[PDB]
Amino acid sequence: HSSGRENLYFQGLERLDEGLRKEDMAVHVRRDHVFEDSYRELHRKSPEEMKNRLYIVFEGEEGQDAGGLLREWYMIISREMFNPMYALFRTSPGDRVTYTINPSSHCNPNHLSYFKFVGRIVAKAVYDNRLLECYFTRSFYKHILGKSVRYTDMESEDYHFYQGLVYLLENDVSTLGYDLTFSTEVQEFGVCEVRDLKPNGANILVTEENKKEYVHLVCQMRMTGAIRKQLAAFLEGFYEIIPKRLISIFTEQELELLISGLPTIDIDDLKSNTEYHKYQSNSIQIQWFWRALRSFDQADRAKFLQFVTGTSKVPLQGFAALEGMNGIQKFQIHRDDRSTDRLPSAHTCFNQLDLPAYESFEKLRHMLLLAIQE
């Protein structure tokens, strides 16, 4: 990552700055109105204007340290961005801690422009190497990167539908008893429609050799169909500061770490807050697991967390506060029992690692690491 790519990205960004001389720029804001005043103050700016040094003025409160204020301000925008009152962002039902665009955002009639704005902010922060406590779904990170969602990502977004997809994948198409079509229901702006996944989609049956393309098409549609206009607006704001070709250098895991930064994983904390199914605390590959995880630099530790959890966010209260689809859910490890040439797999909504009974430490370590990236 730092092995070349991150650094080209800075090189390429600095090259667009060539001959841009930045200014200082006021943000006049009231304390109880920080978010909306900030919108009013910045949304009509140009992208180039938006690359200026911000300094923030809190109306009618005593003169303060500019640096401390800007930091304070970014923190407020971070939390207020995700305030349910604006109806912009909604939590992952699987991962509880992560956010995407709320399909019901249209009840705020400014939502479209607020989405462009929040896009500009996120990208300004990244541009200026300011870290935000913003934690999105991996599907959302994939959207910024222009990367397609895999059916896997559906487990924490729509459990029943994901279960539907798995069933279709593992079964013969006439074994279903019913037959599917190249179309799904979508509720955009409150309105329900059945959208085709391709021309004449509604009249094209899914078959044994259709079903992969079907699964691909339906996930994209399901994940972005209600969201289209909001995403476009977000992506508009973001790409105006960081061009799409530049940001696309990163993977989805990397992108997240870039915005919010690298998390700290206290392994005594995590270990003290782990559950086991089929394995015991002292099963040999559990001991091997802990030994393995501890041997990871913090890059790989963070990526492992993303893998098993669906986010890089460590809870403020520690891993005893770890959450999942069914509520409070500790990290847990199961022995899966399928063949040993599998990689380990995760189901993030249950904060769950499925770990095969590997024959040796070195094999487990090597195999876990593989699972952590591709």
What's the min distance (Å) between Cβ of 240 and Na ion? 32
What's the min distance (Å) between Cβ of 325 and Na ion? 8
Is 129 buried (19+), middle (13-18) or exposed (0-12) by CB count in 10 A? Answer: exposed
What's the min distance (Å) between Cβ of 268 and Na ion? 21
Contact 346, 353 (CB under 8 A): yes
Q: Residue 157 and residue 148: Cα distance in Å, rounded?
A: 15
Q: Residue 257 and residue 234: Cα distance in Å, rounded?
A: 19
Is the CB of 38 or the CB of 351 nearer to Na ion? 351
Amino acid 243 reads P
312 binds Na ion (CB under 5 A): no
The Cβ of residue 211 has, within 10 Å, a number of other Cβ atoms equal to: 17
What's the min distance (Å) between Cβ of 263 and Na ion? 14
The one among 183, 260, 274, 348 contacting Na ion by CB under 5 A: 348
Contact 329, 319 (CB under 8 A): no
**Contact range with Na ion by CB under 5 A, out of 20-28, 261-269, 348-356, 366-374:** 348-356
What's the min distance (Å) between Cβ of 59 and Na ion? 40
Is the CB of 247 or the CB of 265 nearer to Na ion? 265
State how far the alpha carbon of 343 is from the alpha carbons of 255, 338, 365, in Å.
24, 10, 11
Is the CB of 276 or the CB of 361 nearer to Na ion? 276
Q: Which of 107, 134, 219, 349 is catalytic?
A: 349
What's the min distance (Å) between Cβ of 303 and Na ion? 15
| 107 assigned to active site | no
Name all contacts of 84-88 with Cβ < 8 Å and 24+ positions apart: 86/35, 86/114, 87/111, 88/114, 88/115, 88/118
According to DSSP, the β-strands at 53-58 and 327-328 are: unpaired
**Contact range with Na ion by CB under 5 A, out of 75-83, 93-101, 147-155, 293-301:** 93-101
3-state helix, strand, coil in the chain (%, to 5): 45, 15, 40
Contact 83, 125 (CB under 8 A): no
The one among 119, 201, 237, 310 contacting Na ion by CB under 5 A: 310
The one among 95, 256, 300, 354 contacting Na ion by CB under 5 A: 95
Is the CB of 123 or the CB of 134 nearer to Na ion? 134
Is the CB of 135 or the CB of 288 nearer to Na ion? 135
Contact 113, 43 (CB under 8 A): yes
Q: Which residues are catalytic?
A: 349
Positions touching Na ion (CB under 5 A) are: 95, 309-310, 348, 351
